[PDB]
Amino acid sequence: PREPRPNEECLQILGNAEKGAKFLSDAEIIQLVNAKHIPAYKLETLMETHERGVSIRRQLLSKKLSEPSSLQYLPYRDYNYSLVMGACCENVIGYMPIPVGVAGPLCLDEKEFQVPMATTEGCLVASTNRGCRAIGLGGGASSRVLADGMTRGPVVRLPRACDSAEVKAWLETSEGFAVIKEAFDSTSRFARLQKLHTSIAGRNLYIRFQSRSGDAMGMNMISKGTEKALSKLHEYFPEMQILAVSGNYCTDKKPAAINWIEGRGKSVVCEAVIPAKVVREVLKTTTEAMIEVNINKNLVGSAMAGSIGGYNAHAANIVTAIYIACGQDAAQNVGSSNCITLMEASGPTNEDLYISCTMPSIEIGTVGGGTNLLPQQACLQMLGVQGACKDNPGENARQLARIVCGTVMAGELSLMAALAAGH
Amino acid sequence: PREPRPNEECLQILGNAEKGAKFLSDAEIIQLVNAKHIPAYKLETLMETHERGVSIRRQLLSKKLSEPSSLQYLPYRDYNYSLVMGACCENVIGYMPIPVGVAGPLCLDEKEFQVPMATTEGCLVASTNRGCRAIGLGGGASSRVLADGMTRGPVVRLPRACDSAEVKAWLETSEGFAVIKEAFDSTSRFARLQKLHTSIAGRNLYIRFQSRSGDAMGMNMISKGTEKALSKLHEYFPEMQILAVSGNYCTDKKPAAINWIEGRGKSVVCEAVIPAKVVREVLKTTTEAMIEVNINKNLVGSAMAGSIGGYNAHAANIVTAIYIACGQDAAQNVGSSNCITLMEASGPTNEDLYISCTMPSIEIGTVGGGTNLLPQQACLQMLGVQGACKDNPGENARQLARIVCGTVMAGELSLMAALAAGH
Amino acid sequence: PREPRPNEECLQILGNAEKGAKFLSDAEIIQLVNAKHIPAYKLETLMETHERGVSIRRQLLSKKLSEPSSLQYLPYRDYNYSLVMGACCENVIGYMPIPVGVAGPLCLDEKEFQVPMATTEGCLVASTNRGCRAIGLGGGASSRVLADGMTRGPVVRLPRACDSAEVKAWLETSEGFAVIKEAFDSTSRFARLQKLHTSIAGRNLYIRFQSRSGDAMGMNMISKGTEKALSKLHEYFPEMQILAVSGNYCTDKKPAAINWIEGRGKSVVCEAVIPAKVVREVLKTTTEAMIEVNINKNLVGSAMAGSIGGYNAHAANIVTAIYIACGQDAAQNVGSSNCITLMEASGPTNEDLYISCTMPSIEIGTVGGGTNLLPQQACLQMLGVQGACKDNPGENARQLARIVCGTVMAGELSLMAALAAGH
Amino acid sequence: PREPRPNEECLQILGNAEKGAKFLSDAEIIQLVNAKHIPAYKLETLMETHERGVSIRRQLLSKKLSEPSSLQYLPYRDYNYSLVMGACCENVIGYMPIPVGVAGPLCLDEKEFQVPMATTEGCLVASTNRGCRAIGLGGGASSRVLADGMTRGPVVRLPRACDSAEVKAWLETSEGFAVIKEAFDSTSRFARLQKLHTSIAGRNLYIRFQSRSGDAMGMNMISKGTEKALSKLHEYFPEMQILAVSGNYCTDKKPAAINWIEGRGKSVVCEAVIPAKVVREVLKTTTEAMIEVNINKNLVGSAMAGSIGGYNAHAANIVTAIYIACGQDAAQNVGSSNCITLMEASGPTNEDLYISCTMPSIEIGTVGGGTNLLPQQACLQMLGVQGACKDNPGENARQLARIVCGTVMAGELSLMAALAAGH
Numbered sequence A, B, C, D: 001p002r003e004p005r006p007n008e009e010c011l012q013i014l015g016n017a018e019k020g021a022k023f024l025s026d027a028e029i030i031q032l033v034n035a036k037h038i039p040a041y042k043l044e045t046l047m048e049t050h051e052r053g054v055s056i057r058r059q060l061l062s063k064k065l066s067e068p069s070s071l072q073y074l075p076y077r078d079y080n081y082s083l084v085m086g087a088c089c090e091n092v093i094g095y096m097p098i099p100v101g102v103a104g105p106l107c108l109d110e111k112e113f114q115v116p117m118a119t120t121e122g123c124l125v126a127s128t129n130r131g132c133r134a135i136g137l138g139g140g141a142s143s144r145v146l147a148d149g150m151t152r153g154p155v156v157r158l159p160r161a162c163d164s165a166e167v168k169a170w171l172e173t174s175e176g177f178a179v180i181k182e183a184f185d186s187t188s189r190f191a192r193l194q195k196l197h198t199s200i201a202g203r204n205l206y207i208r209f210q211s212r213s214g215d216a217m218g219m220n221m222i223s224k225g226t227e228k229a230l231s232k233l234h235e236y237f238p239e240m241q242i243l244a245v246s247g248n249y250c251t252d253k254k255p256a257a258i259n260w261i262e263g264r265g266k267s268v269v270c271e272a273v274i275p276a277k278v279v280r281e282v283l284k285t286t287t288e289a290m291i292e293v294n295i296n297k298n299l300v301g302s303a304m305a306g307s308i309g310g311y312n313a314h315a316a317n318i319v320t321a322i323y324i325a326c327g328q329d330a331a332q333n334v335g336s337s338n339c340i341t342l343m344e345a346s347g348p349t350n351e352d353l354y355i356s357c358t359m360p361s362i363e364i365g366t367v368g369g370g371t372n373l374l375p376q377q378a379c380l381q382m383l384g385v386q387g388a389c390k391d392n393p394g395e396n397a398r399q400l401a402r403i404v405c406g407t408v409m410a411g412e413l414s415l416m417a418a419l420a421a422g423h
Ligand SMILES: CC(C)c1c(C(=O)Nc2ccccc2)c(-c2ccccc2)c(-c2ccc(F)cc2)n1CC[C@@H](O)C[C@@H](O)CC(=O)O
Pocket: A122, A123, A124, A126, A127, A130, A313, A314, A317, A414, A415, A416, A418, A419, A422, A423, B152, B223, B245, B246, B247, B248, B249, B250, B251, B252, B253
């Protein structure tokens, strides 16, 4: 065996360029960390490899648990931590595997997709698959991006509500907007300020900056632009106080009517027509029953529950699964699952099922954040939308938004059919 | 090398008890699947091991992709698929690793927790950690479960709105409620029907069944009980038509005022007091600035955005990270992140920061679904709440809800301090 | 002519029992008021008649206007001010005439009503009349009161959120509720506390007391009961601070999801079936067009606008007109107009139009407040619901609520037909 | 006495130019109406005077009532019906007197107003008066109009959601908007189309036209412009179906988040600062208590109730009273009472009370509708805003909106002080 060497030593070895770590033992590193000679947060750099750093962190953590063996089945080895450090997570102690299933082919805008879904919910993928099959037999779905821009809603404060009114008026003129647009756009090549939306509350002024952001989701870029624009605004109104760069007016990761009404990120609509025969044989129901259930659940039931933007069956399921599979920020599902599902009779006999899904606030990107990790990049690649689209910036993010809407629609179709048919 | 054998053969080998798979090659299985002799969804059972089944599925999928090499960095090997089959996912082609960091210790109700957070969002864990530290220096946090029961909101339809009124009246009497409660409770040992909430819309009657469910999240159990109760109800009103077992009146996985006002799952409140000195040194701000930002962002900004239940900074971040780490259904964050954050001055000098978070609709469990997988069980175990609590059923789920609320509060504290301090 | 006498005199005459007012002139009273010898608010008592007091007030006001002749066409004479003083208005300077039309007969629950509507909106009464005619030809409407109780939502505050939780738990037990119910019910013969609804936010506890109130609208009585109950509650928790007797949790005269979901005042549903032929000849449209418009305006359009409880065409018009005619508090229309209108196909051929209106928060009374004035009492009397119903307390208020719902439904029918038919 | 003459006769007299009505008796007219020889709706024209026509209508109505004497105290005589016929009401049977009190002087934007309030709610005027006094002692209030335009939200339908997207895109271009603006503006001199707001839901397109309308409230003018613009739009997309001229997307007379977020009619902010001493002596409270109550009632209590736009104490009371006094459409209070009230500490010592009211959707006019009647014109005249302002069109409506906001603020101040002080 062996025993730890004193603390005063073991820094000699740590320092030595040749005789570095890989000569110390785990217990020795533990001792050095417990003595404050190393900061634990740095263990992945000050250590021969990154995996060993997370190992050390795990051992330290285990010592403080009531059940020391808790981490046994949390996997941490043979994972590329270099892409996570300083980018994606801190105090890393391993990774959480989420099973990934595949729904498809989804026939959307004359193409076919195979949609990865990371879920632990049994039967979700199978239900989505049945919906995909129904749509495919129906002659495919169609989608359109209606609007596109990520937003940031800072709140600033003036000495008096009259001053706030003055600032609002100045922002509404062409000259003031031009100045703010120039300041905002100077911060990046994709920063192209669109029309501003202001709201006063007493001496608080809430300003909603909106802009396209290439293929990135846009939060960092929009925030940077917002900060620069607010500095410029401060130049004209030195009494202005920037209270918060986010005033919950964006609105980011909270339910808000503003996202529903004005949009946030990408606004999409998708539609399909399902023949009567296909509704009978694949969905095991009828068009009339589907419409009845749609009206009395997604419209009237949501209305009685007091829903804003929740006029759908389970869009959040599909959205969350895809988001986790493709490296999106999963909290954003809060806003991104806003959807209204409509079903009607169609065809020369009113026997076919027309269905449409409308999702005004799909917050999504294919560059930056979680999309920088290879496993998530794989799921993006199987869709054909990985990374930046050099020719037509933002095209990959738009395509991913369309696929999200189409998959949500297939899921709606399937779950609605199941509810209408009974058990 | 070798070449595939005919299709008529290769079923002989597949059938043979001794000379089964493990004698066929990958190309041979591919051929059999393409000929419809095997259903692909069954590949994980009709194959020597489960891993090989997912391998076959992956190869089939790769053939249909525009970039055949897309799956290269999607990991699938050395993962226990036995627990996922028939429970958690279908058409499995691997798993998605989510980095797991640790925030803590969180000092909550006189105990210390180490909270796992699965995220790809940089700096989230560090910010939560700073909040945890502030709370810890402040003398710890306190929490209470206020209400507990999962809900299912079926919609039924009567011939006339007068009939719907009759059914509603009958449900409101002690005898009718007793009959329905007996029918509902007969379906499981944890099914204990609480008071019903009805809403009429014309001839549609929406009924919200609520009940505790042990340590499970409860959806399956509540749905089963609801179905039995609806059959019983049909016995008294044979003209009733059960339109959908879910009428969006639960409300499950959609923003709804009903969850905010009546609660869903567990309702929790947490609070702490942060000394002025700690607010200065750890949070790098002052109590007055924190209160100003809290009022003008979480209350007024959310009000101007038209938020229902979104009166907080970023509760969805913390909720989503914990949910993914601990095997919860992540779509449920849609409802579970509803929170209101309040900050006030406190102490003999009004210099200390009182903070409270209130979350009325935390949907959460520690048994069933994603909590059946070992990696997620590890994260549950490091909290001390894994599985069913035999002595006091539901205690582990309640504890997990308390920890969720406390972590959300630490996150609020940190992010609010950052916004108040500026860059 | 004549000239004012000194100020020191003119109080002699004012004081004298025999030689009182009616001997002073208008200018003399004006002088006394301007000298502070009389308070203007008392002019209607310290004056030979009430009309003369309002006359004096009018002259005083006229002197301070930029156009002294402004009041010329504001009528004030031959009106009974005795019933308004100390009850209904202060600083009275006349009355505002609102034209009153009559819609009907409305065939409701096998009876016929003639509904007075006080409006200045052209064509409202005629449109309501056409709707009434359609309903009448359709075999009349049917209605039910589903729930009944006015509410008051005080807010109280505890030292800590844990204390608030304790109070909430205590209110939820049978013993605590019994004590509170006794205290509340002791304050009047109609005060019968129903189940309480609580909501915590940090250390704020919001309590919604609900109760029937006879035939009165109930606000005064409910408030009195609430105050008594809060005193009783304070006895058990001496640290409780009653922050406000109304915490906007009632919710009174503001849009709130709580009124929509839980009800406030009376909850009513009304329905009718309109034969296809009648829809063609009276409404000048078809059933299919009516349903299409109903779905895509009252459901989907309201959903896209982010409406809570506004799933109807113009219920506020009818509600406001009736309320003003019948002496109701017209501000209450804010909550009382919440309505959802549903239309469906019906009959053996799906050719007839089924319509239903559901209004969960009709706040209404037939005693107290504006219902104490004779002109408003006349409008109540032509409906047959004036004053208290001695046999069956609250029956007149319930009947008035039913009539309101039925008239709203007729208005919906007519306006929807007009919109569907085009110009 | 006398007896009715046959029916065949009595039309001779009715017809005769010289020997017309005024020779027939009331019973004779009754007989002619009952025989269908006269339509009752025309009684006010085919009769010597208008008053006599309403008299005849009253007698007819009385015959059909269960209590024939119901109309006795409903006044109808000595009222100018000429201005109501064909403009304001139909089937008129009299008028409803509403007592009118006066609150003021209100010191607003360096001027003084005397605000008429038509109410039957006891103590409302006195409370508003106390608020006015506090504001006056505080150095007056200040207000600003932030935005101004009435809206109409038609809904149109396309064959497919892709077609709806095409129409939306075309409306968003400068050329399409120019064409629509020209068509819309051609219909009146005040019709000046501002930027359009569209929302898709499947194949439904909801278009929100907004425009200033002079001093009129604007509904009729905006509707006319909308119809013309929709015809023009139909020229480019012949497959478009105009489903309804109002799709509840305006949104008119329903609670909707869209009015809160985008505004409707006039958006106003008012503010004042109340010295500490004045808060003590007039309001009988302290600044700290006022702020506490404001936060925990108007913000947190409204949030817990799930309010959109109802973050105030009782703005609907003031709004309704003024609207009824000044001839406004009182149903519009539903949208016009949306308000947020904010209170803060202010001054060199944080002892003074800053208060602000923000009302984004004040729907109001001073021409047309109820403002055409002399009694309502009197109330408009005492404010100085009656009729059209020839120099600066719309200035009178803007001034009236400012006064409404200021009066609401005084009412908030008073009621909040009363709640904070207790009984
Ligand atoms: C798998 C999933 C889509 C599903 C199905 C289904 O379609 N099965 C499927 C599987 C394989 C192939 C084909 C179909 C059934 C489902 C529904 C009806 C009949 C059978 C299954 C349900 C489900 C919905 C509500 C319940 F109460 C219980 C279960 N669920 C769960 C949905 C749930 O998470 C969200 C939802 O509850 C939100 C809401 O409605 O408020």
